[PDB]
Amino acid sequence: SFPEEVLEHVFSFIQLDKDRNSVSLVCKSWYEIERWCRRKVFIGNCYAVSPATVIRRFPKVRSVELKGKPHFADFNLVPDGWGGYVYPWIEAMSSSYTWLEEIRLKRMVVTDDCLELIAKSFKNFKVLVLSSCEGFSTDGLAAIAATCRNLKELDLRESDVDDVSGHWLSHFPDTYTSLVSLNISCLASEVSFSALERLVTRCPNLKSLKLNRAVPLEKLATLLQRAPQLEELGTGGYTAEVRPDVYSGLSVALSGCKELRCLSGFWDAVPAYLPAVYSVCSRLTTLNLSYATVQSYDLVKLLCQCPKLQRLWVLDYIEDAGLEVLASTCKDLRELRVFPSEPFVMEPNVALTEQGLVSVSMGCPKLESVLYFCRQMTNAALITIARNRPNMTRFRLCIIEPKAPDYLTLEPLDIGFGAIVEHCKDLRRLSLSGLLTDKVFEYIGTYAKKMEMLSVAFAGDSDLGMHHVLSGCDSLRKLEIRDCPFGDKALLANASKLETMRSLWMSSCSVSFGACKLLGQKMPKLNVEVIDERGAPDSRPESCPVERVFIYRTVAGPRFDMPGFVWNMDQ
């Protein structure tokens, strides 16, 4: 009940977005005090609200996070030009947020113009994370490097950069020294290497260096001798003539890095050079081998020595036998990602099946987080997995053949998934696959009460299934569906669910254009977007399924930068 300054100082110890939202709703007084001391803002859907809105309400923000295209952009199911442009944000912030420090962007279109504007409006600019973004070039980054004198983090992870010129990196002045974190690893072009060594050499706080694979294996040791304090290393190319001097050097240099917790990169890795990495290995909590194309045996030899390993991302080359050795050596595993080595041929090239996942189910009592590509699976295996891991959190299991049944048994996988979902009571994330009838959906609506994100393809028999989901799924935030018999009847019968959810994606389903227009009319605070390259939707009868609807709730109303193939159903 006391002044205004004590509340503020109290607030300063409150940092979770939820907590701040809550205090903002106590009474008008608190709404005002929090407003004014809100240090960061998280905007999961850039079109959900306008910049003018964010900037007028939290005028003191130091740190901004924005997310653009829906997840399925990754699979490119969203045509180019659809939207996600960050420029309007930067333009609006550049005059209000003078003291801005941190920008984190996901799946947005980000332009060299954006990058210059940031460089030259935010003097205290410290952190730039660009995560699967597109639209910019090494020229933009040259801007950042030349101008951002206080920069600590440049993280380019999984972005598509128009790759003019490795010259941009030598634009960091000699008086620059502040770098904590360079994630370089999506760039094709090749940085100046003496510039890179000068840079790493003079930033004594460098903690995380992820290379560029145009920095060839023979050069890594020079780098590592300059940054013995490293905690995360991303190699460049991991290939070279087999020679003893070059092996010996890599290896003294790595075992020089007593602080490595995270090892990644390994393009083109040669078996003959991995063991250089071993002494580092006692200690790793994160190993990402997902671009090494090495055989299950050499993986195992490496795994055998990562007792503290908490997170593994690897190729399917690891195999059932390699994963079993996994279950045995890594009792502290939280997260396993197994990626497809050859996701575009039908025949198995690799002996990796339900069995490896079962192994790991039983052997890693702390495994909570799974992404798995294989070519076959069973109800029985899923059921043993759910039984062994009722603490699973995130379960993403992708069978490469579209409607593959249980291969022993030949049924739909409905009960296997029923089991993961009945038994794993804190499952917040599910993606499933294989032969699936309206009945999984039903299980999903009955048991999956905590579940937040659900991904599905080539599944169900009718609108009943999608109904059970939008029906039963208390905590649904993101629902994304391709190529299923789900349409007008389940969508409109659940129209009001949609206001509680960040987004529904539906492509190639049976949603008529007519249900799209009716939905837009019932629900004026959804943007219901038809995204359909065949030309204007009265071209065809309203009876006619649109190619993609994307639906998301918002306070900005309809958005200003639709291109030619996106229509909003407001009117």
């Binding site: 990754d74 699979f75 490119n76 199911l77 497809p340 996701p343 575009f344 590509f373 992708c398 490469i400």
Partner: peptide, 13 residues
């Protein structure tokens, strides 16, 4: 094959 399947960010198909 089908567009966008299987869902992965690799290069061909």
């Amino acid at each position: 094959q089908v567009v966008g399947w299987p869902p992965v960010r690799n290069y061909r198909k």
